[PDB]
Amino acid sequence: APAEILNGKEISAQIRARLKNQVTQLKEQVPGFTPRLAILQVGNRDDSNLYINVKLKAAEEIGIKATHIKLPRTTTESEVMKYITSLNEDSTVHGFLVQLPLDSENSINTEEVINAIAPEKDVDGLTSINAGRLARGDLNDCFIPCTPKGCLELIKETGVPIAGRHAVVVGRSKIVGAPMHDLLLWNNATVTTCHSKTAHLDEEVNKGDILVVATGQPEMVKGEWIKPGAIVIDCGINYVPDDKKPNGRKVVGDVAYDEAKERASFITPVPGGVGPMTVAMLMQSTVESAKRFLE
Amino acid sequence: APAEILNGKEISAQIRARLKNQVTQLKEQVPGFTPRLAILQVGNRDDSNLYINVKLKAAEEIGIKATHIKLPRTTTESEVMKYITSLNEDSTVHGFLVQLPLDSENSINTEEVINAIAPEKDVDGLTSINAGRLARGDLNDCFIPCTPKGCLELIKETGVPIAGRHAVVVGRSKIVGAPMHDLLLWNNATVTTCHSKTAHLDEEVNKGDILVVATGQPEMVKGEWIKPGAIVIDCGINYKVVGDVAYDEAKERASFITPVPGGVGPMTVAMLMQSTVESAKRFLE
Numbered sequence: 185a186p187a188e189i190l191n192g193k194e195i196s197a198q199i200r201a202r203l204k205n206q207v208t209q210l211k212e213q214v215p216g217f218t219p220r221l222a223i224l225q226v227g228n229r230d231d232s233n234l235y236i237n238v239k240l241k242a243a244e245e246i247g248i249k250a251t252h253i254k255l256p257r258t259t260t261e262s263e264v265m266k267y268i269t270s271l272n273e274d275s276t277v278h279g280f281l282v283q284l285p286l287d288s289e290n291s292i293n294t295e296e297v298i299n300a301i302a303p304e305k306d307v308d309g310l311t312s313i314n315a316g317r318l319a320r321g322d323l324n325d326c327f328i329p330c331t332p333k334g335c336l337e338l339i340k341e342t343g344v345p346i347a348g349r350h351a352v353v354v355g356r357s358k359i360v361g362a363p364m365h366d367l368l369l370w371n372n373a374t375v376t377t378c379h380s381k382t383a384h385l386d387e388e389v390n391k392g393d394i395l396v397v398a399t400g401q402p403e404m405v406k407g408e409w410i411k412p413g414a415i416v417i418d419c420g421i422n423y424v425p426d427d428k429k430p431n432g433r434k435v436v437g438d439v440a441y442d443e444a445k446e447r448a449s450f451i452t453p454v455p456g457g458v459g460p461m462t463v464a465m466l467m468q469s470t471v472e473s474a475k476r477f478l479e
Numbered sequence: 480a481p482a483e484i485l486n487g488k489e490i491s492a493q494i495r496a497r498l499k500n501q502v503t504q505l506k507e508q509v510p511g512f513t514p515r516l517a518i519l520q521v522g523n524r525d526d527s528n529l530y531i532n533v534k535l536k537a538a539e540e541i542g543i544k545a546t547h548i549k550l551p552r553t554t555t556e557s558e559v560m561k562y563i564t565s566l567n568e569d570s571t572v573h574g575f576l577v578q579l580p581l582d583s584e585n586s587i588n589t590e591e592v593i594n595a596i597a598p599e600k601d602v603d604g605l606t607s608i609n610a611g612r613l614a615r616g617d618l619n620d621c622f623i624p625c626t627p628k629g630c631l632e633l634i635k636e637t638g639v640p641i642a643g644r645h646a647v648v649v650g651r652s653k654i655v656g657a658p659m660h661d662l663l664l665w666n667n668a669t670v671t672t673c674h675s676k677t678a679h680l681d682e683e684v685n686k687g688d689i690l691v692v693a694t695g696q697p698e699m700v701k702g703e704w705i706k707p708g709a710i711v712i713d714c715g716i717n718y719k720v721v722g723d724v725a726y727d728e729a730k731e732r733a734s735f736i737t738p739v740p741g742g743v744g745p746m747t748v749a750m751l752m753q754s755t756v757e758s759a760k761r762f763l764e
């Protein structure tokens with residue numbers, strides 16, 4: 185009785201398809217309405233360009249107007265701030281994000297930059313105000329960072345109710361671990377947060393009916409740790425040289441998939457699990473923002 | 480035979496005396512400067528009146544100038560926002576707070592009222608900005624809620640390091656439970672937060688090397704559940720006054736435990752005073 189596989193690629197395809205239909209219907213229901221997203225970029229990093237293009241492409245297929253603002257490396261902190269303020273004030277923009285890391289020749293305080301974003305437009309959900317709302321249970325209108333948001337979607341796809349279940353979160357970062365706990369707690373699970381200072385991590389993990397791992401430590405969570413029947417969600421993206429792969433490298437998660445799939449009732453593969461969910465979540469946050477503005 | 484008692488009244492007394500000399504020292508450096516705290520109250524609850532007087536009493540004894548503004552029950556959210564804005568713009572007021580719960584005949588959104596407070600004067604740490612900072616590990620920048628702070632201070636009085644310990648927080652409210660988890664987590668403990676939807680709470684509590692209960696249910700956490708040798712922090716105030724923990728039973732299993740009263744309560748006022756003196760000093764700096 186091996187674990188059922190949570191196909192993030194197929195699930196995200198369904199999500200993006202449904203969001204397109206939603207967007208179409210909003211535009212027809214309220215003529216003239218244009219859900220708009222804006223991505224602010226500083227510099228010209230190769231990985232950022234790629235990531236940005238993927239986002240803008242998903243947005244245009246869903247029917248969301250995606251605006252890309254690419255500022256030069258020479259940009260100073262004050263200029264980046266002026267754009268953020270202007271984006272905040274632009275009533276045609278429903279949500280926007282600052283693609284990190286900033287690529288500038290000058291010192292720019294990333295945190296100050298990020299926290300200048302109006303909470304109501306913060307689709308990536310990383311501002312302190314937004315983290316604060318999420319952390320305290322304002323799940324009704326706050327923004328949820330794309331990775332933990334996609335993880336909750338996957339957990340819900342299983343059909344197994346979260347309330348009352350013991351969920352374990354390995355990792356406590358601002359991008360995944362922290363907000364992941366918030367989601368699970370406010371979905372009524374008894375959450376236990378683990379990190380690098382956790383003793384007997386194996387025994388801790390073995391208590392999780394729901395397990396979300398976000399450590400960056402390739403395959404550390406062995407299958408023996410997994411509680412029989414648990415829902416395993418692996419956010420890890422670790423590259424390993426493998427000449428048998430088309431591009432000479434394989435992607436492994438933070439969980440030992442092969443042995444963990446024999447224990448879990450549901451597990452996210454790597455690649456093809458949490459990763460493909462990412463862009464859809466941003467698109468979902470963007471539509472949520474647009475609907476709230478529209479109301 | 481029983482667990483060592485964490486005397487919040489004695490411990491708070493020491494912090495308050497520390498704060499007093501700090502305030503005296505500061506006035507000697509800048510004569511005429513006076514740290515100021517302001518407590519906004521809506522309504523006229525008897526318990527809230529008592530709690531404010533205690534905060535006012537500690538302030539005075541430390542040398543802090545505390546103002547008490549009591550608005551009638553007929554008050555609207557719009558009127559409350561007016562006072563908050565006044566306090567934000569009043570350069571002489573370093574730290575201020577809104578006593579909870581609000582006692583009004585009108586519907587007032589507590590989060591909107593609290594979030595109108597300038598984070599620099601949120602000595603109570605209830606704003607989303609302060610909550611967001613604590614919730615993410617950014618402790619250089621924020622004000623932590625007074626009760627969790629008092630609890631962390633009480634845990635530290637055991638001498639026992641927090642790192643690597645399995646801690647259990649029973650309750651997840653914005654005032655104590657939620658911020659208590661954050662404090663323990665960023666103090667490197669492995670934390671489990673329980674609430675009303677938690678199944679087998681007894682088995683969860685039994686995992687706690689450190690236990691913080693803030694549920695508001697009289698002696699609900701039984702002593703049998705206590706992990707032998709645990710540090711029990713009881714935030715409960717239930718009416719005789721009792722904690723959320725069955726004290727007599729829990730004291731025979733715990734190693735260190737907070738009595739009720741004279742435990743977490745005095746510490747809450749002491750920490751509020753501490754954040755106030757900090758808000759005053761950051762103003763001079």
Ligand SMILES: NC(=O)c1ccc[n+]([C@@H]2O[C@H](COP(=O)([O-])OP(=O)(O)OC[C@H]3O[C@@H](n4cnc5c(N)ncnc54)[C@H](OP(=O)(O)O)[C@@H]3O)[C@@H](O)[C@H]2O)c1
Pocket residue numbers: 331354355356357358359360361378379380381382385398399400401404419420421422438458459460462
């Ligand atoms: N699919 C996607 O596109 C996507 C997007 C974002 C993230 N992710 C993935 O998520 C993973 C984590 O990302 P991140 O930004 O959150 O990472 P991070 O900033 O490096 O933080 C890792 C966290 O895990 C803890 N940790 C490190 N080693 C551990 C160990 N051996 N045992 C227990 N806990 C351990 C650390 O604790 P301390 O706090 O004590 O250091 C830290 O909290 C990465 O693999 C990343 O690829 C994927």
Ligand SMILES: NC(=O)c1ccc[n+]([C@@H]2O[C@H](COP(=O)([O-])OP(=O)(O)OC[C@H]3O[C@@H](n4cnc5c(N)ncnc54)[C@H](OP(=O)(O)O)[C@@H]3O)[C@@H](O)[C@H]2O)c1
Pocket residue numbers: 626649650651652653654655656673674675676677680692693694695696699714715716717743744745747748
């Ligand atoms: N000592 C001080 O001076 C100081 C200052 C302030 C507060 N406190 C104290 O902290 C205590 C609680 O205050 P609060 O504002 O946090 O309370 P609250 O708003 O009433 O919240 C109670 C919390 O406990 C949970 N809970 C209720 N029944 C439970 C049960 N039977 N089993 C497990 N969990 C249960 C609730 O979960 P749900 O979220 O699911 O409802 C909720 O999260 C009080 O004693 C208060 O006096 C102390």
Ligand SMILES: Nc1nc(O)c2c(n1)NC[C@@H]1CN(c3ccc(C(=O)N[C@@H](CCC(=O)O)C(=O)O)cc3)C(=O)N21
Pocket residue numbers: 530533576577578579580603625626740741742743744745747748751
């Ligand atoms: N803004 C804001 N700040 C706070 O820090 C609080 C808040 N709201 N809401 C209510 C709670 C109540 N709380 C408080 C303050 C002092 C005492 C206190 O001194 N307690 C004594 C016993 C007092 C008695 O004789 O009954 C104790 O030893 O616990 C208890 C609660 C407090 O101050 N709280």
